[PDB]
């Protein structure tokens, strides 16, 4: 008709993209606090009972 934005959305301008990327789901991380953490010297080992 006249010029309207729906006709020229990709010719006279570009749709705005936000520079913010919105985060996905984050899982709860507790194991380090919720257990005894052993920093091992070897990948295989034993603890005496």
């Amino acid at each position: 008709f006249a010029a309207s934005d729906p006709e020229y959305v990709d010719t006279l301008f570009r749709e705005q993209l936000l520079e913010v990327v919105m985060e996905g789901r984050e899982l709860r991380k507790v194991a380090r606090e919720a257990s005894n953490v052993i920093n091992a010297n070897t990948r295989v080992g034993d603890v005496p009972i």
Binding site: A31, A34, N36, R43
Partner: protein
């Protein structure tokens, strides 16, 4: 910065991995179980699970909880009614309530996600013996345990923790980011732990 973002994803994915190894050991190798059989699933189930560990002469101090179990626990009139709890903190602040980290002689609440347990549905993971959940018969929805009797063992050849490495492929114009950590989880005494079963 897609490389920084992928470095963050890689680190997070490894942390999620530690949590999976931990939760899978914790749920599978607990030597005691409280079968709620529907019915008295809130505080009574926690007290009964502490009772199982007490009967094997250990003292639990921590509980790990599924979202469905948390939901049921906060619907328990013993916690939901300020009268019965001695505090309105569960009615108001819910999981952030100081009483939720201080139930049944336990010092710590470890709120966990539904996805963390190894169902064997995730690619490369072989599956634990149980179901992590609290919405169908036989699901394990909480573990009541002694935090000092379960060991998360972390190994790295270089340094102490997650190693992140990067590479350029000049032939293909690709940049790669690789993370690694070695983890195991083991009970010293599996009798120090009780699952709560639906």
């Amino acid at each position: 910065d897609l490389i920084e973002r992928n470095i963050q994803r890689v680190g997070a994915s490894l942390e999620n991995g530690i949590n999976r190894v931990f939760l899978t050991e914790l749920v599978d190798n607990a030597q005691n179980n409280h079968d709620t059989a529907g019915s008295n699933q809130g505080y009574q189930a926690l007290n009964s699970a502490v009772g199982e560990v007490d009967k094997d002469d250990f003292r639990p101090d921590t509980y790990v909880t599924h979202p469905d179990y948390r939901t049921q626990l906060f619907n328990d009139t013993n916690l939901a009614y300020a009268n019965r709890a001695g505090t309105n903190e569960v009615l108001r602040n819910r999981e952030d309530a100081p009483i939720v980290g201080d139930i049944a002689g336990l010092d710590m609440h470890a709120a966990m996600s539904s996805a963390t347990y190894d169902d064997g549905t995730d690619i490369g993971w072989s599956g634990g013996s149980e179901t992590w959940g609290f919405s169908s018969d036989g699901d394990k929805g909480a573990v009541v345990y002694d935090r000092d009797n379960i060991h998360t063992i972390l190994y790295a050849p270089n340094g102490q923790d997650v190693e992140i490495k990067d590479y350029e492929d000049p032939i293909r114009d690709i940049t790669g980011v690789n993370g690694r950590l070695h983890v195991d989880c083991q009970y010293s005494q599996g009798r120090s732990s009780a699952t709560v079963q639906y």
